[PDB]
């Protein structure tokens, strides 16, 4: 398409030479460059202090994993190994056994945070919508053991975020 970066001799004779020499003799353009930051100082900065103010987000955002449940009790996860095979990090492990009598829903359910690159693939591959990614930021531990999620339990403890998840999924069915 061509645009050209080269100026091809801005100075020609007398008048065009002197002003190109004036900027190199003293400064001028450095004083003009000083004025750029000068007005930039006066205008209000966009700063957010975290313990009081919070930054912008979205209805669909992936953070720490938490598995959802039905409104009338019952664990929504059905045990498929579907999310296990899609997982590109292989962070999720699943071994399933029959629950007492009749029902067949999970036994072993570990999601590694040492692994997991956060895709929302396990959210997408799930037909029952068990793992739904909630707006999470707060996670800090002393050990790997405290960081990697155990057999559901702490994932089921996502009830504190499941109220937000139920609100966020209402913006998810028939996507946006």
């Amino acid at each position: 398409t061509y645009k050209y970066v080269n100026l091809r001799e801005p100075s020609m004779d007398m008048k065009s030479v002197t002003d190109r020499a004036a900027q190199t003799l003293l400064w001028t353009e450095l004083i003009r460059g000083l004025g750029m930051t000068l007005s930039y100082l006066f205008r209000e900065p966009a700063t957010i202090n975290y313990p009081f103010e919070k930054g912008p987000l979205s209805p669909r955002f992936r953070g720490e994993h938490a598995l959802r449940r039905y409104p009338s009790g019952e664990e929504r996860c059905i045990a498929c190994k579907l999310c296990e095979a899609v997982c590109p990090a292989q962070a999720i492990t699943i071994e399933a056994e029959p629950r007492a009598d009749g029902s067949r829903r999970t036994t072993r359910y570990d999601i590694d945070m040492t692994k997991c690159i956060y895709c929302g693939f396990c959210q997408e591959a799930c037909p029952v919508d068990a793992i739904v990614e909630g707006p999470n930021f707060e996670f800090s531990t002393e050990t790997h053991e405290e960081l990697l999620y155990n057999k559901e339990k702490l994932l089921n403890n996502g009830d504190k975020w499941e109220a937000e998840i139920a609100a966020n999924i209402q913006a998810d069915y028939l996507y946006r």
């Binding site: 398409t1 050209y4 080269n6 353009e29 450095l30 003009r32 750029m36 037909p127 069915y173 946006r176």
Partner: protein, 370 residues
């Protein structure tokens, strides 16, 4: 980050052999075991700056294997997000380059604007930076109603924001003092290194992939390619800013032309069907069960695709079996090409010039892997 073994005759460099590869993650052998849908987020996490420009090269490579065109709507999203990465990369091609020199303001001036850019990414996909958004089935998820009004709202204020850098950096004597006359290489020997993005494009040859080889609805969108004259660091910087001023033209034309329709490929042997669709009908859920876990069942054959990166190219070379696992591929990032140039670029230059060479070539260490 970089080791850089130096040979100095007094003060200036004689031999500059970059002993690099300190971030070889080992994607080569690792993708061999993963399926096509499983291998997707590796490409985003290859380069540190480009997100939607990555996967774009990978998805089209699978699309050239499957011989299946993405829907007409999804292709327009791909350009809208392909040009938004051309904004993201060319911000970092200026800011960290200036930060490596010693300039403090232009980094923080743009990163206010760049943080507003990840609001688009968060509203369109889960995570902030890397997204499993561009897929072999076109585009994973449609744009929400809020975003399309925000793109126009951002672009209106953007033209003044980018022009603030030109009255700050290009006009000043410092840049005409520092970056001028560092490694003026434009000959047939410069062509013997193969940079594609900038360098050859920035100075000398009028060749570009955007005009010559269309990817997803091209030539229909009006493009402007900046080509300089001298192969120095300053003219190779000017073209990047001239790319940025002549990039909103594409984004505005993306907003002008948007046909409503399909988001994924309607054929359910490539892309998983809708969530409301899979719960009721039978064939949808079985295909959902087999597009996940099991891969794609790809046609066998060796294919090479290269889509213009703001750094250079992503020369993905997928070799395929009958099985769902792609056996070996190589991502040909320009990191191998740019660091090879330092054998000629450093000839008769100071230690401070070397830092300016890396910045103008934009060697972000994530590039060098394959």
């Amino acid at each position: 980050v970089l080791r850089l073994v130096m040979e100095l005759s007094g003060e200036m460099v004689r031999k500059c052999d970059p002993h690099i590869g300190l971030l070889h993650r080992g994607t080569e052998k690792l993708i061999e075991y993963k399926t096509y849908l499983q291998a997707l987020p590796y490409f985003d996490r290859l380069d540190y700056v480009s997100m939607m420009c990555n996967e774009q090269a990978y998805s089209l490579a699978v699309e050239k294997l499957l011989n299946i065109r993405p829907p007409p709507r999804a292709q327009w999203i791909r350009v809208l997000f392909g040009e938004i990465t051309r904004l993201l990369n060319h911000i970092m091609a200026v800011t960290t380059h200036a930060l490596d020199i010693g300039a403090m303001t232009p980094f923080f001036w743009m990163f206010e604007e760049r943080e507003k850019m990840f609001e688009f990414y968060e509203r369109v996909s889960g995570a902030r930076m890397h997204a499993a958004y561009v897929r072999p089935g076109g585009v994973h998820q449609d744009l929400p109603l809020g975003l399309m009004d925000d793109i126009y709202e951002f672009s209106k204020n953007f033209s003044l924001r980018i022009d603030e850098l030109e009255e700050m950096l290009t006009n000043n004597r410092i840049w005409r003092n520092r970056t001028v006359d560092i490694g003026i290489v434009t000959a047939e020997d410069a062509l013997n290194y193969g940079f594609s993005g900038v360098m050859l494009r920035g100075s000398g040859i009028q060749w570009d992939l955007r005009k010559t080889q269309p990817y997803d609805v091209y030539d229909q969108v009006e493009f402007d390619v900046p080509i300089g004259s001298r192969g120095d660091c300053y003219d190779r910087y000017l073209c990047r800013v001239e790319e940025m001023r002549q990039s909103i033209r594409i984004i505005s034309q993306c907003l002008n032309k948007m046909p409503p329709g399909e988001i994924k490929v309607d054929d359910a042997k490539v892309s998983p069907p809708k969530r409301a669709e899979m719960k009721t009908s039978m064939e949808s859920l079985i295909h959902h069960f087999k597009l996940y876990t099991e891969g794609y069942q790809v046609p066998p054959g060796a294919t090479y695709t290269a889509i213009e990166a703001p750094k250079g190219e992503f020369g993905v070379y997928l070799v395929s079996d009958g099985s769902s696992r792609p056996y070996r591929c190589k991502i040909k990032a320009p990191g191998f090409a740019h660091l090879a140039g330092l054998d000629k670029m450093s000839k008769g230059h100071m230690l401070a010039d070397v830092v300016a060479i890396i910045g103008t070539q934009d060697i972000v260490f994530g590039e060098v892997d394959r």
